[PDB]
A = this chain, B = another copy of it.
Amino acid sequence: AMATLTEDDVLEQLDAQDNLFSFMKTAHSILLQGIRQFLPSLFVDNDEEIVEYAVKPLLAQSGPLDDIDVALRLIYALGKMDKWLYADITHFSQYWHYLNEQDETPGFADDITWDFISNVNSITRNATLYDALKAMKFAVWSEARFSGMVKTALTLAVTTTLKELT
């Protein structure tokens, strides 16, 4: 369980990450914490029996909501999340599971990760970012530059994802 999320120490954390794996590991943790900080808005607020004996154990660490996938499902099931946002976070979660359980070799510039970002709504719906990313992909180019831009895009997805949850 982390501290509290600013845009810019999230931005520091993610820029520090120099490979897709570390980035994704760090992203998953940032999103997790983002989601856990949103969880109290699902519940009663103003009654201290409910908070102390129901809400707290429900949100304790290693408790029943300390998993990005059960927590997401709850927010979605309560009608508190738009489908587009739900789809983005579970892709991140799916790719993290993929990288951490099956394979951690794919970098920023790979086929498999280009397909991933082609399905992240917060990336593909920003029209200039994605066009720039396609122009760059399909242009005597540079692997580092394209890689850096891929990291930018992904950082933008988690940033905009974080903004939607407060």
Contact surface of A with B, Cβ cutoff 8 Å = 42-44, 49-50, 53-55, 57-58, 64-65, 67, 70, 72-74, 76-79, 83, 86
Contact = CB atoms under 8 A, between A and B. Distances in A.
A15 to B, nearest CB: 33
How many copies of the polypeptide does the oligomer hold? 2
A50 B70 contact: no
Given A64-B70, A83-B49, A54 B42 contact: no
B83 A43 contact: no
Contacts of A43: 77-79
Contact of A77 (B50, B77, B79, B86): B50
Nearest to A39: B77
A53 B93 CA distance: 15
A76 B64 contact: no
